[PDB]
Design a binder for these strands. Structure first.
Lengths: 218, 990, 416
DNA sequence: CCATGATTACGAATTGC
DNA sequence: TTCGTAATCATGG
């Protein structure tokens, strides 16, 4: 729960205590990447790049990740859509409603649930150019992901091609599950059953299952 | 219309095809596109029981399907193998289809394509124009490969185009990065279809303040401002970074044949692409021959360690020397300079002396035939030359003579006449040169970069990668680009499929295979007597042929858990399974409770693995014979490539039989091969140990009895020889493993040892051995000190060599490149190894005589060094790399680095490499017991002066020295006593 | 992984871990194999004393309510669970029961999934029911089903307590008299309605008493159990040979004995003596005689006899000569398959009742002389293995195992 | 009791500036 | 996948 100063924008990063023992190294990378980053307008704004850092890692068990953020109307919190217009979040909400049997709903937020963390591998992306910022973020993304993996219980990946060889990216052996594309053609995502294996392992890991219904918005 | 194939590649678009690249006699390039299908093998009933008809079906005939599952039996009542003979069909499907009871599912689609269409991957063919339809310029489409490729013509020579590249970036403290470090130099070697070898270098301008560029241009270089105004014929071009990257992208986009780079898939191409993208949004595009698919560069990884590959789809082969060298054969260090050391070498004579220079002459009358020509070829772009493998010299004047070379170098005078020359490390520090940049540095770095670029071509021609690629593509039935990317489990399916189709048999496994569960040491290390080396001629393939060990020729496995049933089973085994038709092999049990396991193999009908091995051996022998009778260099290279390919494919069978997920899994056959090999090795060791030559007759130590069953050969231990009468020698046996056997003769006459070794080889091959087991005399070793086949040093004389010949200094196991040991320990080990080699030849060494002398010398030298303190600090400096990728809490190195950062304005980053040493107070005396050494590590800076209140912790270095020396030598108790006297600790041997 | 097979397998492992039993070798092997598969495919995974509370031996006030009282007997305890074989405490091995009993137990178990396991009391080849543990069904409910299948059932008392009751000696005596069972009552286990915890009461007290000698009594087909006699002639029940050796009994000495209101039992030796088990094994054998061998927990004969076992083991009529024996085996129609599916060495071992591990160790240390598929001569190779006196006894009795083996091989050759 | 033996853990053997 | 050295703990002479 302190603050650090950076030469370039956003010029100030506020961090939680649990993020202390890696965040130092983070700055030494952001100094050699931000100069080329600010040339092109990107979503979200640079001030909102590191707003997910506030969520503590102690009371979280499940990690959900995406390869890229929302190209348009990004907010900083991954997989968040206040207007419920993104295809991925709509499909996720429909799948959750089908699994839980709830018919009436207005929206879903993954940040409301206590125990799961929404994360993005690449923390920034230019509007209209999907996955055009891998080179800038690669090392920072790897460092942050290996910090998350040391505290979560089970980690689930979205997208087969995006996370094809995610095991080699992380040195620490941790229970990992890789899923299919969130919006795969031929209704491939409709048959996905990762939300059950997740809490089967959670119970097997002597951890309380996740009450998914808390993520609903009414 | 006559075309020779070069490469076969695939397109991974929505509609997949297969592409063939070929060259005609004139030099034009022709691309042919085929449709790629999915191949399935089915039984006749399944073929007639398909509701949707397949796209096309071709009959295969009668095939016999055999279940090769292995079942453990505890009695001697064995059920016979169940085999089914039926008609089989081969069907093709444009898209993937699931078949309930398909067979032969462990073979690739490209192999099926090649075998069904009867096409060789590198054969020369006279195509037919009827079946080819033109779709673009240089790209045709074919639909009936069977008839278009029916005619075959003899091979004809074709031209080729090559590209070699080298990159030099900017760095001051750490490894270069795209974001802060620019590119300074690029070097290119270019070979077109006309046979003209161009060579150029591009230099950056951003570090060349205007007047300096004016002077450089006045010297003779060319300055360009736009991409279009560059000419390839001018050696040095001085331009900006953006233009440099544009030129690099344009060069990499051409339709070459080979782009060869040393570790360029990780650093060079990646850096070029990243920097080009960062500076300008313009990318690099690879296009398909039919102009239907466009891709961008993205180097991907394969785990086997990590190997990087390019995603091109235009037919060009992006080839990397690093991976090929790592997987082809094993060295000590895989650096470029070390490979150049071990590759380009020669012997030269000193023709002049005086001042600080020497004149060396090199000709075929000094070393061998062909070494001088290769050295002259390398010398064209060389700048530094290594002499005596110890000193480095700068070339001043070089003249290539008619059949040799002469070069003048700068080195101190040496009292000799014939020396050794090689190309290796360069005494150039790139870090200091970038601090004060100037034209002299720029030109010197350009020369170094162009030499680095040409080294790739020299190594490519030295290793013969082209011919090896062609031979592998032909033999393995695989595309050219896939030859050096797959392991043994993939390069074996082609010949196996061909043999299965010829034999008309299929092997099926209808269960799951459970995951069921030696180092040799020489009798002594120091010898001081001549050692004769014999090489077994493919021991495991011959064992497999002799025992007929194949999965489908295993009658059964009989096990027993007690001696009564074991004896009853043995009696019935000898009763109802008699030799020589059946062979019974004892093996180690696979379960903790079984006491006896016996495998039974039938030799009435030949198996599958023995047939493949015999075919490979016969082909290799034929190619050896054809090579020995060829005069053209191209034919010699082709035959050598073919024989090497056959060797490397025939030496992989033993590993593949014991691999769970292979196509030749046979666990009992694996045990049988190992057991028979061990029995043969032990029998030869027993018969050779003690055999002596008395008068003109020879005696062995045991009867020449067949070690498996009764045989009709003569079994008289006494044999009659033809050597001179006066010889009275005694022989000893020391070392023996699968691929070699060692013998010891007590003399120092190399010619006598060679002739007696030849006579022994003849007698052993003719009389002692049996069936297709034979040995070959390899070499004679002198001054042998060894710990294993991994670690040993000696001097080697070949079989075809006399006494007045240059020895071969064999030395391996040691690295001499481990940058975390010392600068002083290496020198001391070198000095004492030289002393050991020089003193072991005196004659009166025995066992407890050399150890005393070497220990006394070590004690005296160490005491003198400790009492003198004359060694400089730079000889005791160690290095490490700073990185925070550490587990645990402290890992004291991080604390030391942080303390140094706090207490010194100079900063050490998280990528820099820092030096450290062991510093203790100047008043502490010699200590025997030792404690945590991590406390005494101190960071040595550029301005660090060792004060009068400090000294170097010598005991650690001396302990490592004595440990490594004591790893050698024979006596153990003396070494223990010496080590306890010095440091009071127990050495860790082996 | 999208198919439901992996997740079904995962709940299968979850259930197995919830009901883990290290005794069953097959179950543990399957669990280890599936754990290896999971930890290799996913690179990592997260993976009857405790059913009984502290024992009560003093009077105390009880909470009023409804309780079920059952008698714990003095005998070897076995636990039977679905998907696993029979299990006895301590050793972790299994036993052999008739297939009809196993089928009845399976029919009892699969009816209600809440029954964790069933309790078996074994004492001198007699299997009886004592108690059961189920999270949903009371043991009284399944007692009727067990009795319906023909298996014996214990005496259960359903008592409703209204006021405070002290569980003193007199109340225990009243409960024992109300139970009225001839078999020994080693303890009383009571379960409260709606409570999953199991609580048991066993009063005990110690004294010192003399023993005249230790004998052994006949129980049946080569099964013997030691019998100790005292000065007063009253019999003290002993569990097995393991209990006898762990108690460190000594002949003609005063020993400490834990007594009930009806029977007194020897208790284990908790002293800090340096006595070694190995020499106690030979001393007790010498005192009882060299004609007995320790078949684990019991004693077995060494009698010659020889020919009067294949009839007994095969359950056929008596035999006189070889030819009529062959004919009697020939006319057999059902048991004959046992001859055609099971080996000869194992059949002879079963006929003479030797142990498995001990006999396997014995036959791996001596040499034979086999002729015409028959054994004629034998001798020892290493004499160290005869350190165990039982091995010496089997070595002495080997001259009859050889003959019965020869006869079985002869009849096997004659039949086919 | 403590010298000796055996585990554990660390990290280069790495390669291209 | 290897080897190699230090730091720690554990065990029988």
């Amino acid at each position: 729960m302190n603050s650090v100063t950076i030469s370039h924008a956003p010029y100030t990063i506020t961090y939680h205590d649990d993020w202390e023992p890696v965040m130092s190294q983070l700055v030494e990378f952001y100094n050699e990447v931000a100069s080329w980053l600010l040339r092109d307008e990107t979503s979200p704004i640079p001030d909102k790049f590191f707003i997910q850092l506030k969520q503590p890692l102690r009371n979280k068990r499940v990690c959900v990740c995406g390869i890229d953020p929302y190209p348009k109307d990004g907010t900083g919190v991954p997989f968040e859509s206040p207007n419920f217009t993104k295809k991925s979040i709509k499909e996720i909400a429909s799948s959750i409603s089908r699994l839980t049997g709830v018919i009436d709903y207005k929206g879903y937020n993954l940040n409301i649930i206590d125990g799961v963390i929404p994360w993005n591998y690449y923390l920034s992306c230019k509007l209209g150019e999907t996955k055009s910022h891998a080179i800038y973020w690669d090392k920072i993304s790897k460092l942050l992901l290996q910090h998350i993996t040391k505290h979560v219980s089970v980690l689930y990946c979205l997208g087969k091609t995006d996370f094809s060889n995610i095991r080699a990216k992380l040195e620490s052996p941790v229970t990992t599950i890789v899923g299919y594309h969130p919006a795969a053609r031929d209704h491939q995502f409709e048959k996905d059953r990762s939300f059950e294996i997740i809490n089967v392992l959670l119970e097997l890991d002597n951890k309380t299952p996740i009450n998914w219904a808390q993520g609903f918005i009414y | 219309m006559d075309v020779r194939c070069i490469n076969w590649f695939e397109s991974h678009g929505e509609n997949r095809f297969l592409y063939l690249k070929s060259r005609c006699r004139n030099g034009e390039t022709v691309f042919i596109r085929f449709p790629h299908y999915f191949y399935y093998v089915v039984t006749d009933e399944i073929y007639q029981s398909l509701s949707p008809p397949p796209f096309n079906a071709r009959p295969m005939g009668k095939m016999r399907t055999i279940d090769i599952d292995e079942t453990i039996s505890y009695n001697l009542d064995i059920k016979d193998r169940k085999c089914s003979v039926a008609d089989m069909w081969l069907i093709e499907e444009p898209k993937k289809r699931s078949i309930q009871n398909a067979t032969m599912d462990e073979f690739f689609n490209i192999s099926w394509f090649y075998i069904s269409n009867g096409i060789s991957p590198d054969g020369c063919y006279s195509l037919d124009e009827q079946y080819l339809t033109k779709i673009n310029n240089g790209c045709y489409h074919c639909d009936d490969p069977r008839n278009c490729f029916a005619k075959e013509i003899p091979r004809f020579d074709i031209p080729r185009s090559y590209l070699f590249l080298a990159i030099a970036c900017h760095f001051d403290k750490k490894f270069p990065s795209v974001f802060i470090n620019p590119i300074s130099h690029t070097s290119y070697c270019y070979i077109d279809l006309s046979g003209k070898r161009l060579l150029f270098t591009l230099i950056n301008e951003e570090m060349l303040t205007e007047q300096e560029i004016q002077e450089a241009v006045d010297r003779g270089c060319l300055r360009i401002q736009s991409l279009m105004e560059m000419d390839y014929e001018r050696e040095l071009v001085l331009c900006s970074e953006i233009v440099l990257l544009r030129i690099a992208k344009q060069l990499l986009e051409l339709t070459f044949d080979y782009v060869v780079t040393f570790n360029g898939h990780n650093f060079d191409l990646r850096y070029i692409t990243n920097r080009l993208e960062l500076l300008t949004g313009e990318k690099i595009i690879f296009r398909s021959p039919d102009k239907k698919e466009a891709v961008h560069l993205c180097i991907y990884e394969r785990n086997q360690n990590t190997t990087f590959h390019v995603n091109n789809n235009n037919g060009t082969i992006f080839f990397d020397l690093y991976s090929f060298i790592q997987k082809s054969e094993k060295l000590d260090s895989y650096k470029l300079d070390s490979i150049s050391k071990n590759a380009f070498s020669c012997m030269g004579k000193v023709l002049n002396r005086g001042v600080r220079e020497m004149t060396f002459i090199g000709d075929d009358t000094t070393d061998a035939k062909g070494k001088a020509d290769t050295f002259a070829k390398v010398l064209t772009t060389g700048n530094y030359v290594t002499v005596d493998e110890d000193i480095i010299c700068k070339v001043i004047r070089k003249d290539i003579l008619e059949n040799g070379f002469k070069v003048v170098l700068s080195c101190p005078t040496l009292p000799n006449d014939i020396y050794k020359l090689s190309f290796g490390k360069d005494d150039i520090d790139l870090a200091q040169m970038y601090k004060d940049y100037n034209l002299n540095i720029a030109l010197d770095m350009a020369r170094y970069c162009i030499h680095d670029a040409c080294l790739c071509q020299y190594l490519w021609e030295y290793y013969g990668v082209e011919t090896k690629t062609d031979a592998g593509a032909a033999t393995y039935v695989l595309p050219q680009s896939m030859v050096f990317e797959y392991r043994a489990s993939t390069i074996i399916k082609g010949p196996l499929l061909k043999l299965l189709l010829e034999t008309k048999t299929i092997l099926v496994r209808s269960e799951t295979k459970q995951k069921f569960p030696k180092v040799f040491a020489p009798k002594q290390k120091m010898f001081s007597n001549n050692v004769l080396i014999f090489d077994y001629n493919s021991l495991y393939p011959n064992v497999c042929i002799f025992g007929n060990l194949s999965p489908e020729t295993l009658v059964g496995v009989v096990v027993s858990t007690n001696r009564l049933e074991e004896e009853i089973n043995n009696q019935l085994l000898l009763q109802k399974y008699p030799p020589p038709r059946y062979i019974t092999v004892h093996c180690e049990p696979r379960l903790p409770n079984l006491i006896s396991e016996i495998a039974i193999f039938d030799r009435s009908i030949e198996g599958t693995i023995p047939r493949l091995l015999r075919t490979f051996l016969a082909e290799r022998a034929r190619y050896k014979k054809m090579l020995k009778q060829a005069t053209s260099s191209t034919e010699k290279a082709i035959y050598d490539s073919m024989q090497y390919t056959y060797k490397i494919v025939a030496n992989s069978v033993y590993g593949l039989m014991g691999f769970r997920n292979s196509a030749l899994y046979s666990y009992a056959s694996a045990k049988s091969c190992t057991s028979i090999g061990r029995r043969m090795i032990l029998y030869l060791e027993s018969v050779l140990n003690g055999a002596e030559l008395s008068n003109g007759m020879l005696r062995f130590a045991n009867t020449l009895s067949n070690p498996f069953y009764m045989d009709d050969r003569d079994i008289n231990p006494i044999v009659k020889t033809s050597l001179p009468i006066d010889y009275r020698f005694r022989f000893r046996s020391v070392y023996g493993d699968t691929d070699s056997v060692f013998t010891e003769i007590d003399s120092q006459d190399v010619d006598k040892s060679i002739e007696i070794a030849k006579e022994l080889e003849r007698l052993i091959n003719s009389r002692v051995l049996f069936n297709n087991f034979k040995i070959e005399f390899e070499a004679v070793y002198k001054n042998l000190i060894m710990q294993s086949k991994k670690k040993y040093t000696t001097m080697k004389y070949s079989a075809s060599s006399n006494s007045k010949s240059v020895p071969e200094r064999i030395n391996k196991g040691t690295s001499e490149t481990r940058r975390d040991v010392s600068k002083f320990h290496k020198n001391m080990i070198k000095t004492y190894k030289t002393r050991l080699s020089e003193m072991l030849s005196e004659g009166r060494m025995n066992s407890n005589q050399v150890c005393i002398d070497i220990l006394r010398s070590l004690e005296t030298d160490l005491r003198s060094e400790f009492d003198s303190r004359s060694s400089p600090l730079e000889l005791f400096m160690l290095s490490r790399m700073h990185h925070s990728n550490y587990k645990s809490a402290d890992n004291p190195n991080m604390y030391l680095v942080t303390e140094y950062n706090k207490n010194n304005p100079e900063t050490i980053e998280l990528g820099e490499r820092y030096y450290f040493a062991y510093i203790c107070p100047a008043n502490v005396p010699w200590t025997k017991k030792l404690v945590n050494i991590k406390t005494y590590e101190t960071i040595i800076d550029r301005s660090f002066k060792l004060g009068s209140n400090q000294r170097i912790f010598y005991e650690v270095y001396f302990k490592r020295l004595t440990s490594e020396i004591v790893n050698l030598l024979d006596n153990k108790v003396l070494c223990i006593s010496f080590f306890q006297r010095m440091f009071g600790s127990r050495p860790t041997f082996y | 992984m999208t198919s439901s097979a992996d997740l079904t397998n995962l709940k299968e492992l979850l259930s197995l871990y919830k009901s883990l039993r290290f005794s069953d070798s097959v179950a543990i092997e399957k669990y280890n194999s599936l754990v290896e598969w999971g930890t290799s495919t996913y690179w990592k995974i997260g993976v009857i004393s405790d059913y009984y509370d502290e024992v009560k031996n003093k009077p105390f006030n009880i909470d009023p309510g409804y309780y079920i009282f059952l008698p714990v007997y003095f005998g070897s305890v076995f636990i039977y669970s679905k998907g696993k074989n029979m299990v006895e405490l301590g050793s972790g091995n299994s036993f052999q029961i008739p297939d009809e009993i196993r089928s009845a137990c399976n029919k009892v178990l699969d009816s209600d999934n809440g029954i964790d396991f069933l309790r078996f009391v074994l004492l001198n080849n007699r299997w009886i029911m004592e108690d059961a543990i189920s999270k949903y069904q009371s043991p009284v409910n399944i007692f009727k089903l067990a009795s319906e299948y023909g298996l014996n059932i214990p005496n259960y008392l359903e008592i409703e307590i209204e006021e405070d009751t002290l569980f003193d000696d007199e109340l225990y005596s009243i409960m024992e008299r109300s139970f009225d069972d001839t078999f020994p009552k080693i303890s009383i286990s009571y379960i409260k309605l709606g409570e999953l915890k199991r609580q048991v009461v066993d009063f005990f007290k110690f004294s010192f008493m003399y023993i005249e000698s230790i004998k052994v009594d006949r129980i049946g087909d080569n099964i013997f159990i030691p019998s100790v006699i005292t000065k007063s002639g009253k019999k003290i029940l002993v569990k097995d040979v393991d209990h006898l050796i762990r108690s460190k009994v000594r002949e003609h000495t005063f020993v400490k004995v834990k007594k009930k209101n009806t029977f007194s039992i020897l208790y284990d030796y908790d002293g800090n003596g340096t006595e070694t088990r190995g020499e106690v094994i030979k001393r007790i054998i010498d005192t009882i005689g060299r004609d007995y061998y320790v078949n684990g927990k019991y004693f077995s004969k060494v009698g010659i006899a020889g020919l009067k076992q294949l009839t007994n083991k095969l359950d056929i009529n008596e035999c006189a000569t070889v030819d009529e024996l062959v004919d009697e085996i020939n006319k057999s129609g059902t048991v004959k398959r046992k001859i055609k599916n099971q080996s000869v060495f194992d059949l002879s071992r079963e006929c003479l009742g030797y142990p498995e591990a001990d006999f396997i160790t014995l036959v791996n240390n001596m040499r034979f002389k086999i002729e015409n598929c028959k054994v004629v001569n034998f001798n020892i190779e290493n004499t160290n293995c005869l350190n165990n006196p039982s091995i010496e006894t089997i070595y002495g009795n080997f001259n009859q195992f050889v003959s019965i083996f020869n006869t079985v091989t002869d009849v096997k050759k004659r039949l086919f």
